[PDB]
Specification:
Two copies of one chain form a homodimer. Chain A is an all-alpha fold. Chain A has one domain. Chain A has one helix at about 1-35. The first copy, chain A, is rod-shaped. The termini of chain A are far apart. The interface of A and B includes residues 2, 6, 9, 23 and 27 of A. Chains A, B: It is found in: Cell junction; Endoplasmic reticulum; Cell membrane. Chains A, B: This is Vascular endothelial growth factor receptor 2. Chains A, B: Belongs to the protein kinase superfamily. Tyr protein kinase family. CSF-1/PDGF receptor subfamily.
Chain lengths: ~35, ~35
């Protein structure tokens, strides 16, 4: 159903968003570490 | 309403997801460029 899908999607979108956030931090971390020396 | 929200959220989540994707690529691009020399 439409609703059932709306909820399901949100769950999948929420998890994916959390990952990108964490992954993005780690990436910027290693990159910022090299900039220093 | 619930539905109205479900749709709205999706739109916002879709856009944010597209950004992270592109931004992630650019980041890995500059990082991969340095790895080479």
């Amino acid at each position: 159903e439409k609703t059932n899908l709306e909820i399901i999607i949100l769950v999948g979108t929420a998890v994916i968003a959390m990952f990108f956030w964490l992954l993005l931090v780690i990436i910027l971390r290693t990159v910022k570490r090299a900039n220093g020396g």
